Amino acid sequence: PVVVEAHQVDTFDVPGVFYENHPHEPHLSGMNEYNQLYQQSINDPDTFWARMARDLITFEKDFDKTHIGTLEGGDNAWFVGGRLNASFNCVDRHAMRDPNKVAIIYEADEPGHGRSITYAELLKEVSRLAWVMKSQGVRKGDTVAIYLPMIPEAIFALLACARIGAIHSVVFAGFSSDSLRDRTLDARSKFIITTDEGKRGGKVIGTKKIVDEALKQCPDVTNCLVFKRTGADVPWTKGRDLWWHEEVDKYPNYLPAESMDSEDPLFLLYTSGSTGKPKGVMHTTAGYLVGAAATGKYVFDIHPADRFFCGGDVGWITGHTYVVYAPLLLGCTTVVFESTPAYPNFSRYWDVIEKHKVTQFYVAPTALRLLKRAGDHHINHEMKDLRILGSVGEPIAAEVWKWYHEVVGKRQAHIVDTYWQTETGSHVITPLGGITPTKPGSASLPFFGIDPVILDPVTGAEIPGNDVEGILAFRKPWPSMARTVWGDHKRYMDTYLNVYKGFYFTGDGAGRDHEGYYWIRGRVDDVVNVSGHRLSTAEIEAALIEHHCVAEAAVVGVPDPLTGQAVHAFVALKSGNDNREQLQKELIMQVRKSIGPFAAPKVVFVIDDLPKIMRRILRKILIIDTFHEWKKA
Ligand SMILES: CC(C)(COP(=O)(O)OP(=O)(O)OC[C@H]1O[C@@H](n2cnc3c(N)ncnc32)[C@H](O)[C@@H]1OP(=O)(O)O)[C@@H](O)C(=O)NCCC(=O)NCCS
Numbered sequence: 001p002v003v004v005e006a007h008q009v010d011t012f013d014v015p016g017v018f019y020e021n022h023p024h025e026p027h028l029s030g031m032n033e034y035n036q037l038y039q040q041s042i043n044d045p046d047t048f049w050a051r052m053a054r055d056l057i058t059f060e061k062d063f064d065k066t067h068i069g070t071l072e073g074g075d076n077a078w079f080v081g082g083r084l085n086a087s088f089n090c091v092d093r094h095a096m097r098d099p100n101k102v103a104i105i106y107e108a109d110e111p112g113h114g115r116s117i118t119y120a121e122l123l124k125e126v127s128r129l130a131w132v133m134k135s136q137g138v139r140k141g142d143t144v145a146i147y148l149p150m151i152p153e154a155i156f157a158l159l160a161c162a163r164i165g166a167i168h169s170v171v172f173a174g175f176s177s178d179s180l181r182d183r184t185l186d187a188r189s190k191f192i193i194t195t196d197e198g199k200r201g202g203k204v205i206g207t208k209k210i211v212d213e214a215l216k217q218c219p220d221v222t223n224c225l226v227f228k229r230t231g232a233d234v235p236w237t238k239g240r241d242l243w244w245h246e247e248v249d250k251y252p253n254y255l256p257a258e259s260m261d262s263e264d265p266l267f268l269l270y271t272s273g274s275t276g277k278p279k280g281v282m283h284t285t286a287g288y289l290v291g292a293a294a295t296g297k298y299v300f301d302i303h304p305a306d307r308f309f310c311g312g313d314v315g316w317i318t319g320h321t322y323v324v325y326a327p328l329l330l331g332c333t334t335v336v337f338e339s340t341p342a343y344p345n346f347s348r349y350w351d352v353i354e355k356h357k358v359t360q361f362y363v364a365p366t367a368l369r370l371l372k373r374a375g376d377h378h379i380n381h382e383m384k385d386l387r388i389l390g391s392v393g394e395p396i397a398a399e400v401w402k403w404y405h406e407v408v409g410k411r412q413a414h415i416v417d418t419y420w421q422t423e424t425g426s427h428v429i430t431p432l433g434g435i436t437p438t439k440p441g442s443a444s445l446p447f448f449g450i451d452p453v454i455l456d457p458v459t460g461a462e463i464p465g466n467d468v469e470g471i472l473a474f475r476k477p478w479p480s481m482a483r484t485v486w487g488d489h490k491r492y493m494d495t496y497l498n499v500y501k502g503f504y505f506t507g508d509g510a511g512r513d514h515e516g517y518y519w520i521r522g523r524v525d526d527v528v529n530v531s532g533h534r535l536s537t538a539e540i541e542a543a544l545i546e547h548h549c550v551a552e553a554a555v556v557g558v559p560d561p562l563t564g565q566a567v568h569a570f571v572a573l574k575s576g577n578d579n580r581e582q583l584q585k586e587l588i589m590q591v592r593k594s595i596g597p598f599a600a601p602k603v604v605f606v607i608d609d610l611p612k613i614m615r616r617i618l619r620k621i622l623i624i625d626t627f628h629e630w631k632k633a
């Protein structure tokens, strides 16, 4: 058995109770209609995607052609000639039909302190925030830096940017001032939106102070709009800082939506890679939205009356596509969850799902492991409407898949392990909720329009048939594919499209078993996934070298029972300090300062010299004889 994971792995059918309890009708009649539609999406994408786009997205001007360009040309364009606006499709068209339908359920950090926001209320808040940016000089095509925690104002900000055709560039609120600065400079943003403070798990995040530090080196930022989240006294810079609540009160509660081209940029999302600084992955407008709506509908079985709850942060692509764009495009309710799965206690996810009658839940296996370690007594909730259990970031493995399926889902929900990445925009290999039979540990089958191949890692040759393993690549473009790396299309080409010419390179290894099901093996480059966070080891090495006592640095990923992988750092010193215990703390702090707390290495080892650097020798072990003794200590 070449794909060793799939050996004697039975395939599980969709639970019968899923159909009998379903509030509506499934979007597909069964696996046969999936197969028909899938073959059409590969053999005639021009027809398949034109119909899908006209089903799901309201265009101001119809498009002339479904797709032009090729993978090797790096010139792909989708729905060319079309015009539309993302905020119109997420807000206006739903407010017009059903103004009092709840668009957003805000669950605050403290339980009992949220609110519900209707589509009409959302149109007001998006409109008047867009008025603020317009009045302060933001124009179509400008980037806007967003440094916000998980509050509904974050949705207001993304959609207000989209409404005027500004390009939002969301920076995860766990990033340091250095990381925020680098992203604001590269994007050349002149406007930033933040909070006075964030509250997460009962802890205060000093967002305004972090922004102040970053802006000292962003001289082109001329306004900082501050949302009063906590009311605490924060430093204030007159002439630059503005209060969200003071400014929006000045402006009307409606604003026209800017007419955007299908291929106008919608957002940038800075993303860590195998080498170099983070890349501003750029998504344009029509194709991204089509993919978001298509996966939201067919993967997550989203219907307009649903209450969809993605547990991912707006700072990441999961938050972009499935907290914001997909559910709002489809017109359902989305949950914005400010807290952690552990605050006030380990029942929190289920408290929220029960109070709001959540129908689909989307989670990371790290959170599941963390909760399973806490004990099954924290779960004692009916959650009658919960029929889809989504998982992302790493394979949800046997022990966790069983615990997610039995203890959380009561054998009534369909577990959908969705494989994708920032660069694909939306799900690309995934079961379809309520339709696709699954296997624990497997992402199952390609989504519509996704033509995956397994490549020999060295020769680059395609390996045909089933029970094969190698490099995961896609053979054809798809609507929501990232279109460039901001300011560096050559890097985009070299990273994704010139490695295996004619294919799109995922950076992941994979196996395709006897049934054609995919088994994601993980990154083949120097990217590690820690608590669902995509980290570059080269970035962490660069951060450690910023320390005055560090000469060389080597960072590797090692398996971790809770976080999947954990980053361990090896450092060689420049001259020799007599404070090695204290030096380790300053090294840890250096990474927390250069990147952010969440990227900190678990341990920083000090060696005389390092093994180009043979990182493979370090990853297996966790002067070759000396490091084995140094580790064994
Ligand atoms: C599982 C999870 C909830 C754990 O949260 P946690 O209790 O903060 O633990 P973490 O290991 O992530 O955090 C480590 C550090 O990052 C920081 N951090 C994490 N998330 C943060 C955020 N949203 N804002 C600010 N800081 C954050 C913590 O405060 C902590 O800092 P500290 O060293 O000063 O204590 C979080 O890691 C997570 O969401 N992982 C999943 C990512 C993902 O794949 N989401 C998609 C799901 S659909």
Ligand SMILES: CCOP(=O)(O)OC[C@H]1O[C@@H](n2cnc3c(N)ncnc32)[C@H](O)[C@@H]1O
Residues within 6 Å of the ligand: 271, 316, 317, 318, 391, 392, 393, 394, 395, 396, 417, 418, 419, 420, 421, 422, 423, 443, 506, 507, 508, 520, 522, 523, 529, 533, 534
């Ligand atoms: C959506 C977050 O996208 P990113 O933060 O850009 O990380 C994307 C990288 O995470 C990994 N990955 C994501 N989903 C899965 C999964 N279901 N099974 C296995 N691995 C997965 C993979 O290595 C990919 O290349």
